[PDB]
Structures are given as C-alpha cells and as structure tokens.
From Swiss-Prot:
The gene is TBXT. GO terms for molecular function: DNA-binding transcription factor activity; DNA-binding transcription factor activity, RNA polymerase II-specific; RNA polymerase II cis-regulatory region sequence-specific DNA binding; RNA polymerase II-specific DNA-binding transcription factor binding; sequence-specific double-stranded DNA binding; transcription corepressor activity. GO terms for biological process: anterior/posterior axis specification, embryo; cardiac muscle cell myoblast differentiation; cell fate specification; heart morphogenesis; mesoderm development; mesoderm formation; negative regulation of transcription by RNA polymerase II; positive regulation of transcription by RNA polymerase II. Monomer. Transmembrane segments: none annotated. It is linked to Neural tube defects: Congenital malformations of the central nervous system and adjacent structures related to defective neural tube closure during the first trimester of pregnancy. Failure of neural tube closure can occur at any level of the embryonic axis. Common NTD forms include anencephaly, myelomeningocele and spina bifida, which result from the failure of fusion in the cranial and spinal region of the neural tube. NTDs have a multifactorial etiology encompassing both genetic and environmental components. It is found in: Nucleus. The chain holds residues 41 to 211 of 435 of the full protein. Residues 11-171 bind DNA. Detected in testis, but not in other, normal tissues. Detected in lung tumors (at protein level). Involved in the transcriptional regulation of genes required for mesoderm formation and differentiation. Binds to a palindromic T site 5'-TTCACACCTAGGTGTGAA-3' DNA sequence and activates gene transcription when bound to such a site. Keywords: Activator, Developmental protein, Disease variant, DNA-binding, Nucleus, Transcription, Transcription regulation. One of its GO terms (cellular component) is nucleus. This is T-box transcription factor T.
Length: 171
C-alpha cells in the first residue's frame, strides 16, 4: 500500500498547539517549518510528479483579538489554491523513497504573480495537501494526502510572539 507520513511531526505539533502562522509577501516567502514527507509503497521503476496545494480549512477571515485567533462572522467561498510542482519532478519511485520529499523552495505570496509562488488569502487558515501523480505509464493515478499537523493561518506579519520565538528557536 502507498504510505505517506509527515517527517518531524513532533516539531509541527509544537507550532500547531500555538496556532501556526506562515508569512506571505508580494514576492513570496519560503515556509518554516518546511513540509517534509516520507513515502513508501511506490513502484521504484514507475514515474511520479509530486504536487503541493493548500486547502482553505474553513471559509472565514481570522483576526488576532486580545491574544487569541477568532473567526469572522461572514464566510465567503474559497477558490482552491494553485498547485506547486516539486522541482525534482518528474522522477522514479526510487528517487522519491530514498529521502524525505522536502518542499523547501515553495514560496507563499498574497499577490497574483508570474510563476512558482503560490498565492494565498492573508488571514485564512490553510491545510497543506500533496498529490502523488503516476505519470508516463498508460494508467495515470493520483493519491492525495492532507497534513492536519501543518495547518497554519497566512499572515503578513506574526501576531502571536510565541510563534515568532518558536520559528527562531528551531531554524
Ligand atoms: C517544477 C516543475 C517540475 C516538473 C514539471 C513537469 N510537469 C509535471 O510533472 C506535471 C505535474 C503532473 C505532471 C513542471 N514544473
């Protein structure tokens, strides 16, 4: 069976217990922590492209009110995010399974922009998601996996200083 697991879940859970925040910039900001995924059960000889996207976890705008994150009252539908293709794609199963697949080069922005960077809505909550796409073969297949542990709110600057501190302590 194709098995997908989160590397360094320990550390993600520290961020999650405080409510994680990720900075977004007009040019794009790399994520910390970085999403690293353990994959087994691929055909070492089959070809796969790894895709990363961000699901809007709810339909609300969030605000840091008196030291606490709280959702707005006025939900709007959230158009799905664009997909980031791992730069190592497309590649053999063996390649993907020899070390954690690390999305270190994805950049999160708040502005519609040339290419690469993924645009998110500031003050929305996001759940990272990957797609493993079997390519080249006749039988195209997709396996998707969500990472609740890696939920965050997109912010233009950190609101919770406990997050600012953890981000520096562990980088
Ligand atoms: C950074 C980068 C790497 C590879 C590619 C090639 N396209 C794919 O792999 C498609 C996604 C499913 C097939 C484009 N961009």
């Amino acid at each position: 069976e194709l098995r997908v697991g989160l590397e360094e879940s320990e550390l993600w859970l520290r961020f999650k217990e405080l409510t994680n925040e990720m900075i977004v910039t007009k040019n794009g900001r790399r994520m910390f922590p970085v999403l690293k995924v353990n994959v087994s059960g691929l055909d070492p000889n089959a070809m796969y492209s790894f895709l990363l996207d961000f699901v809007a976890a709810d339909n609300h705008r969030w605000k840091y009110v008196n030291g606490e994150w709280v959702p707005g009252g006025k939900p709007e539908p959230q158009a799905p995010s664009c997909v980031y293709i791992h730069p190592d794609s497309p590649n053999f199963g063996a390649h993907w399974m020899k070390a954690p697949v690390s999305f270190s080069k994805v950049k999160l922005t708040n502005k519609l922009n040339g290419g690469g960077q993924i645009m998110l809505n500031s003050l929305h909550k996001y759940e990272p998601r990957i797609h493993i796409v079997r390519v080249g073969g006749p039988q195209r297949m997709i396996t998707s996996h969500c990472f609740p542990e890696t939920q965050f709110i997109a912010v233009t600057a950190y609101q919770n200083e406990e997050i600012t501190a953890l981000k520096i302590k562990y980088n």
